[PDB]
Amino acid sequence: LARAGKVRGQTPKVAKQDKKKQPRGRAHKRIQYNRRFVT
Amino acid sequence: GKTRGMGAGRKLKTHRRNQRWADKAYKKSHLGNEWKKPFAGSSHAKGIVLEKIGIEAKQPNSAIRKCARVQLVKNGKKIAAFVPNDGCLNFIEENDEVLIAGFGRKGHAVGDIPGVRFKVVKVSGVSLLALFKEKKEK
Amino acid sequence: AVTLRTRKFMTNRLLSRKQFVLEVIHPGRANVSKADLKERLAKIYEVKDSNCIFVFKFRTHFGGGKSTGFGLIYDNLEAAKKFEPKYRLIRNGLATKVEKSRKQIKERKNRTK
Amino acid sequence: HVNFYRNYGKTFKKPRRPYEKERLDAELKLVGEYGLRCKRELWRVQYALSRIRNAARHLLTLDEKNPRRIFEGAALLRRMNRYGLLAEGQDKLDYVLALTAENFLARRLQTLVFKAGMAKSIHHARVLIRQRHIRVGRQIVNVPSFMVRVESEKHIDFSLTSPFGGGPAGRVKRKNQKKAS
Amino acid sequence: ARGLKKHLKRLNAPSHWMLDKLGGAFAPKPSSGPHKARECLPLILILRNRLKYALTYREVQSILMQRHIMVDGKVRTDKTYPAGFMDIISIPKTGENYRLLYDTKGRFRLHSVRDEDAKFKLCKVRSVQFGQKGIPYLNTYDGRTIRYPDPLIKANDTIKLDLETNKIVDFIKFDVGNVVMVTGGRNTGRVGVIKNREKHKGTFETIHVEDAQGHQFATRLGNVFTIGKGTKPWVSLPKGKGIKLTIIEEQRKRDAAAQAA
RNA sequence: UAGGAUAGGGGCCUACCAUGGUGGUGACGGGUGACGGAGAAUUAGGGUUCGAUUCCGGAGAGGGAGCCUGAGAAACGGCUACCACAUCCAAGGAAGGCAGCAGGCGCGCAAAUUACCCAAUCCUGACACGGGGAGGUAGUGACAAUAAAUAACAAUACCGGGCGCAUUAGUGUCUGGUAAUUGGAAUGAGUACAAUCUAAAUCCCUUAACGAGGAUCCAUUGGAGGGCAAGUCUGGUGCCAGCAGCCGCGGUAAUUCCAGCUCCAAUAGCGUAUAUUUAAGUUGUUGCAGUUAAAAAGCUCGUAGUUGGACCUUGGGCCGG
Ligand SMILES: [Mg+2]
Ligand SMILES: [Mg+2]
Ligand SMILES: [Mg+2]
Ligand SMILES: [Mg+2]
Ligand SMILES: [Mg+2]
Ligand SMILES: [Mg+2]
Ligand SMILES: [Mg+2]
Ligand SMILES: [Mg+2]
Ligand SMILES: [Mg+2]
Ligand SMILES: [Mg+2]
Ligand SMILES: [Mg+2]
Ligand SMILES: [Mg+2]
Ligand SMILES: [Mg+2]
Ligand SMILES: [Mg+2]
Ligand SMILES: [Mg+2]
Ligand SMILES: [Mg+2]
Ligand SMILES: [Mg+2]
Ligand SMILES: [Mg+2]
Ligand SMILES: [Mg+2]
Ligand SMILES: [Mg+2]
């Protein structure tokens, strides 16, 4: 019971970037289509 | 071999009624002991924890799986229940109000945790995944 | 530039009205108000009294420009008084409504006498 | 309590084996090549095909001159011909089994817009459908799975209100115009 | 339960009433009357749902309380009256007569008739037996009781009744070879000529009937109804002359009506 | 058998008499977290499991019991008595029955408004007018189900594969994208004049003017060893924390934990738990197996049960397509 939270506290805190959103829905299947086997 | 007379419907129906009992699933499902288990035919069960315990892990592994002894408000059973997240045990505290659910394998011990069939899915009325993900603190 | 055509039209001189489904075609226009339908439908049928009319249950179809509804040409406003539900006379201003408060309306009144 | 009595059901079914490369990439082939919103639309198409093929299979099980066979065989065949989903000289009640999900996907209104032009892209076709830009006879349709019949196929055309084929210019037009003026 | 059931729910309603499913919770619940009340139509169904002279319960109430709607020679203001087979429904203000008959698909049409074939009705008899002081009387399936019956009129037969003399003018003897039309079951609506009648001791009597164009069928006695002697009916048949046509044939009718225009 | 009672048959009950009725084809008894059915889920076929619930039938109104009125009640939004519970009392007394609608407590894993309305569907009354928490309308409602947005199109670009010669080039066609790159178009989410809807409002359907620069009008759920689709990425931890349905990972180079990038499957949905169907030809009548994997009784007799050899003219013709 002494060692609870050990590693999850050991890990450093880091933050995301501010990624541009990927398209949702139809446009997302579009990018999948014309990225897998159109390119 | 089988009995296949055109008039043997009574024998075949009695024989299947008699021989379905050797099937484990049918026996478990109709024997009536599922109402004598702790949940007694319930999916979840709100209970009160007695203490954060921590227990050994089985031979190939070696670790301390952090469980808790909970009492069932509904029928007084005292059981052991796991806490399924990293360092999540701290959120639990003595005599808190938790929701205990089946831990998988349908009422049968899971993985390397010895003889524990239950998992904590809520505490003090707050989602425990939310506690893990800082979405909402109790 | 909106037109007005009526079908499923039937006369009932049991209740002496002229009952029909109207299928107004109103392109561009959002929808045509019933108060404005009244005088057009009056001036096409020559009813001599644009108040016997009562029109109700409009839809304004998906995509717009085309609307359905019911129309009831009464011949005598007396007939339209007797043979009509109260609510749409109240709508066209020919009757008025009163508000209820149901306590003592019957219950504690049933106790004294 | 009435309105309990209004029936309703399911239209697709999630596939049996979730993670298969063959089926996954075949379905991506179809979804990308018809520009669909997701694979729910595709699964509705296999569901409708499964329904019609079950009916046709049961009909073919029986023998001819059986009035039940003839009646809904003819009903199913005229349904197919109204949707133009079978060609001429092809009414045999087996070419109903022969057809596949490509046939249904080819009748959807997005596809028909694409094949009649007026889109410059199939995804552009879908959007034009959903911004009320297209009518069929006189009624503007915004459901890209509209399943046009051939008797409506000939005159699928723009609305009388869309800026492209109808009346007044759109709000972007009128903002640019009023700030220019 | 503890008494008569006074509400009827739309799904529980007879299937030949045609009335829809989301139209409400309850159905008109035809009152106790002179006809079997599962084989009947309320005058509310006659008015609102078929002729559409009104649009609501209350407007049909206005219709009936005006005393216009006259049935079988006398006005009936009840709004759940069980009007049924060859009841004649007249309206003086429209001067318009109707007679209620089965159509071939098992439902009820209101066939217009002129005044001469609306001055009278036609019904079958339930049974003829004696009464007080030995005066014979007969009972019809319309419920009517007629005293001093013609010594030849027997059970299961058919009788015409005017609405002024209010008695018998003539009668069809239910026998082999007279045109009938079944009034219940899956064969209801179809007119036809009785071609055979076999009796089995202690059970329903079976009637084998042939339609006007070849088809043959069978029926129980309580369902058949002689109309006229021989092939000729004594009543104006509906637009289908009592021939139920197979679904393929009726598809061909609509296909031909399409290709004729 | 005779009678009594019932509206009426009847051991329903009484008097007398007889010694009968059910059962291995399962009575009687016990369990049922059991109201029955129409039906629900799943289904190649056959099946398996469920069915409190809006349709029909039955039964109850806290638990039993007994009756008035009435055509209809052993009624409970009727009464009488007892038992359990409880309210007012000025302390003698009195009123009770939400498993009706709404709402409150408790029980729990578990379930909404103390709303409006008689306009519809019908019922009801002495009755065209009254009444109707039946029933409808509205508020909460990711129970389930349906359609379905979250961008589209153009040239610019470092570029990226042929196609015009294809060498030696170079730029070329659908544009593939890292492009907050550049650009004007399209619109509904939302706001909202109005009208329509409505018993009156509200929603939907129409539509004055407003309403998109990509940071926003921002899509999540779970997963990235095998099954099983997707990292022999990077940092941290070091048989610990923890993961993991199972096999397994972690003992200082972790594809498995905690994190970031990337990616994947589904997508306004998905994970989790239990129960159940499929898988299951692991309940097998269709359709399993018994030498050795679990399973031929030690052996024979044996009643029910199941199963039972062959044999009986439509033998040859006409006739109509
Ligand atoms: Mg098993
Ligand atoms: Mg192990
Ligand atoms: Mg009842
Ligand atoms: Mg007796
Ligand atoms: Mg029970
Ligand atoms: Mg019931
Ligand atoms: Mg009761
Ligand atoms: Mg009682
Ligand atoms: Mg009550
Ligand atoms: Mg309640
Ligand atoms: Mg994630
Ligand atoms: Mg993870
Ligand atoms: Mg990871
Ligand atoms: Mg893989
Ligand atoms: Mg897991
Ligand atoms: Mg894993
Ligand atoms: Mg086996
Ligand atoms: Mg062995
Ligand atoms: Mg042996
Ligand atoms: Mg034997």
HEC sequence for E181-215: ECCCCCCCCCEEEEEEEECCCCCCCEEEEECCCCC
Q: Distance between terminal CA atoms of chain D? A: 60
Burial environment of residue E83 by CB neighbours within 10 A (0 to 12, 13 to 18, 19 or more) = buried
Q: Write the DSSP assignment of D14-63 as a string of letters.
A: --SSS--HHHHHHHHHHHHHTT-S-HHHHHHHHHHHHHHHHHHHHHHHS-
- Tell me how far apart the alpha carbons of residues E6 and E28 are, in angstroms, rounded to a whole number: 10
Which letter, b or e, does each residue of B104-133 get, where b requires 16 or more Cβ atoms within 10 Å of its Cβ? eeeeeeeeebeebbbbbbbbeeeebeebee
Long-range CB contacts (< 8 A, 24+ apart) of D91-94? D93/D56, D93/D59, D93/D60, D94/D56, D94/D60
The reported resolution of this PDB entry, expressed in Å, is 3.4
Amino acid (one-letter) located at E86: M
Sequence-separated (6 or more) residues with CB below 8 Å from residue E112: E96, E97, E98, E99
Chains that touch B (3 or more CB pairs under 8 A): A
Q: Check whether residue D39 has its CB closer than 7 Å to nucleic acid strand F.
A: yes
Q: Write the DSSP assignment of B67-99 as a string of letters.
A: EEEEEETTT--EEEEE--STTGGGT--TT-EEE
- Would residue C14 be called left, alpha or beta, if left means φ above 0 and alpha means ψ between -120 and 50 degrees? alpha
* CA nearest to C24, candidates C52, C51, C53, C61: C61
- Tell me how far apart the alpha carbons of residues C64 and E237 are, in angstroms, rounded to a whole number: 46
- Tell me how far apart the alpha carbons of residues D180 and B109 are, in angstroms, rounded to a whole number: 75
- Tell me how far apart the alpha carbons of residues C91 and C57 are, in angstroms, rounded to a whole number: 13
Q: Confirm if E84 and E39 have CB atoms less than 8 A apart.
A: yes
- Would residue B40 be called left, alpha or beta, if left means φ above 0 and alpha means ψ between -120 and 50 degrees? left
Amino acid (one-letter) located at D180: A
Long-range CB contacts (< 8 A, 24+ apart) of D68-75? D70/E248, D71/E247, D71/E248, D71/E251, D74/E251
Q: Is B45 helix (H, G, I), strand (E, B) or coil?
A: strand
φ and ψ at C43, to 5 degrees? -75, -10
- Tell me how far apart the alpha carbons of residues E139 and E156 are, in angstroms, rounded to a whole number: 10
- Tell me how far apart the alpha carbons of residues E140 and E131 are, in angstroms, rounded to a whole number: 15
For residue B19, how far is its CA from the centre of ligand 17 (angstroms)? 13
* CA nearest to C60, candidates C35, C32, C38, C36: C32
- Tell me how far apart the alpha carbons of residues E68 and E45 are, in angstroms, rounded to a whole number: 16
Whether chain C has a CB inside 8 Å of the CB on E58: the answer is yes
Crossing angle of helices E247-259 and D67-82, in 10° steps, is: 40
E25 contacts on D by Cβ (under 8 Å): 1-2
The residue behind tokens 């060609």 is D87
φ and ψ at D94, to 5 degrees? -100, -30
Long-range CB contacts (< 8 A, 24+ apart) of B60-69? B60/B112, B61/B112, B63/B112, B64/A3, B65/B112, B65/B113, B65/B116, B66/A1, B66/A4, B67/B113, B67/B116, B68/B92, B68/B98, B68/B120
- Tell me how far apart the alpha carbons of residues C40 and C43 are, in angstroms, rounded to a whole number: 5
For residue C43 the two structure tokens come to 């001036």
Long-range CB contacts (< 8 A, 24+ apart) of E66-73? E66/C14, E68/C14, E68/E92, E68/E93, E69/E43, E71/E43, E72/E121, E72/E163, E73/E163, E73/E164, E73/E166
- Tell me how far apart the alpha carbons of residues B44 and B61 are, in angstroms, rounded to a whole number: 29
* CA nearest to D128, candidates D146, D144, D145: D144
| Partner residues linked to B123 by β-bridges | B98, B126
Helix, strand, coil percent content, chain C, rounded in steps of 5 = 20, 20, 60
**E224 secondary structure, DSSP code:** -
Q: How many CB atoms lie within 10 A of CB C103?
A: 9
**E153 secondary structure, DSSP code:** -
- Tell me how far apart the alpha carbons of residues E172 and E124 are, in angstroms, rounded to a whole number: 9
Which letter, b or e, does each residue of E158-175 get, where b requires 16 or more Cβ atoms within 10 Å of its Cβ? bbbbeeeeeebeebbebe
* Residues, Cβ < 5 Å to ion ligand 1: B 25
E259 contacts on D by Cβ (under 8 Å): none
To 5 degrees, how large is the angle CA E67–CA E70–CA E71? 145
Sequence-separated (6 or more) residues with CB below 8 Å from residue E229: E172, E178, E179
For residue B110 the two structure tokens come to 């899971």
Protein residue with the closest CA to the C1' atom of nucleotide F242: B86
- Tell me how far apart the alpha carbons of residues A26 and D38 are, in angstroms, rounded to a whole number: 6
Q: Confirm if B65 and B57 have CB atoms less than 8 A apart.
A: yes
Q: Confirm if C23 and C5 have CB atoms less than 8 A apart.
A: yes
The residue behind tokens 């959903």 is D130
Which ranges of chain B would DSSP assign to H, the alpha helix? Answer: 9-19, 24-30, 128-132
Tell how far CA D90 is from the center of its chain.
21
Burial environment of residue D32 by CB neighbours within 10 A (0 to 12, 13 to 18, 19 or more) = buried
Q: With CB atoms and an 8 Å threshold, state whether D139 touches C61.
A: yes
- Rounded to whole angstroms, the distance from the CA of residue B44 to the C1' of nucleotide F61 is 34
- Tell me how far apart the alpha carbons of residues E146 and E163 are, in angstroms, rounded to a whole number: 13
Q: Confirm if E182 and E210 have CB atoms less than 8 A apart.
A: no
E248 contacts on D by Cβ (under 8 Å): 67, 70-71
Burial environment of residue E62 by CB neighbours within 10 A (0 to 12, 13 to 18, 19 or more) = middle
Q: How many CB atoms lie within 10 A of CB D69?
A: 17
The residue behind tokens 């209004």 is D6
Sequence-separated (6 or more) residues with CB below 8 Å from residue D18: none
- Would residue E157 be called left, alpha or beta, if left means φ above 0 and alpha means ψ between -120 and 50 degrees? beta
For residue D95 the two structure tokens come to 């070419």
Beta strands in chain C (DSSP E): 6-12, 17-22, 55-56, 69-74
Chains that touch D (3 or more CB pairs under 8 A): A, C, E
Burial environment of residue D175 by CB neighbours within 10 A (0 to 12, 13 to 18, 19 or more) = exposed
Please give the helix or strand (H or E) that residue E62 lies within, else none.
Answer: helix E57-65
* Residues, Cβ < 5 Å to ion ligand 3: E 1
Which letter, b or e, does each residue of E105-132 get, where b requires 16 or more Cβ atoms within 10 Å of its Cβ? ebebbbbebeeebbebbbbbbbebeeee
Whether chain B has a CB inside 8 Å of the CB on A2: the answer is no
- Within chain A, how many helices (H) and strands (E) appear? 2, 0
**C63 secondary structure, DSSP code:** T
Q: Confirm if D38 and D28 have CB atoms less than 8 A apart.
A: no
Tell how far CA D56 is from the center of its chain.
20
Mark out chain D residues that contact chain A at CB-CB < 8 A: 25, 28-29, 31-33, 35-38, 123, 126
Sequence-separated (6 or more) residues with CB below 8 Å from residue D7: none
Q: Confirm if E41 and C62 have CB atoms less than 8 A apart.
A: no
- Tell me how far apart the alpha carbons of residues E22 and C36 are, in angstroms, rounded to a whole number: 34
- Tell me how far apart the alpha carbons of residues E91 and E86 are, in angstroms, rounded to a whole number: 16
Give the nucleotide with minimal C1' distance to the Cα of E64: F128
Q: Check whether residue A32 has its CB closer than 7 Å to nucleic acid strand F.
A: yes
User: In chain F, which nucleotides are within 7 Å of a protein Cβ?
Assistant: 25-26, 31, 33, 54-59, 71-76, 107-110, 117-124, 128-129, 132, 134-137, 144-154, 174-180, 184-188, 193-200, 205-208, 210-212, 214-216, 218-219, 222, 228-230, 235-237, 239-251, 254, 257-262, 264-268, 270-276, 282-286, 288-290, 296, 305-308
Q: Is C12 helix (H, G, I), strand (E, B) or coil?
A: strand
Q: What's the longest Cα–Cα distance across chain E? A: 69
Amino acid (one-letter) located at C2: V
The residue behind tokens 């001067």 is E95
Whether chain A has a CB inside 8 Å of the CB on B64: the answer is yes
- Tell me how far apart the alpha carbons of residues E19 and E26 are, in angstroms, rounded to a whole number: 11
- Tell me how far apart the alpha carbons of residues C108 and D51 are, in angstroms, rounded to a whole number: 63
Q: Is A36 helix (H, G, I), strand (E, B) or coil?
A: helix
**A12 secondary structure, DSSP code:** P
For residue C102, how far is its CA from the centre of ligand 10 (angstroms)? 21
- Tell me how far apart the alpha carbons of residues B99 and B49 are, in angstroms, rounded to a whole number: 10
* CA nearest to E206, candidates E215, E219, E194: E219
Of D3, D6, D67, the CB nearest to E248: D67
- Tell me how far apart the alpha carbons of residues E160 and D94 are, in angstroms, rounded to a whole number: 58
Write a three-state SS string for E64-126: HHCCCCEECCEECCCCCCEECCCCEEEECCCCEEEEEEEECCCEEEEEECCCHHHCEEEEEEE
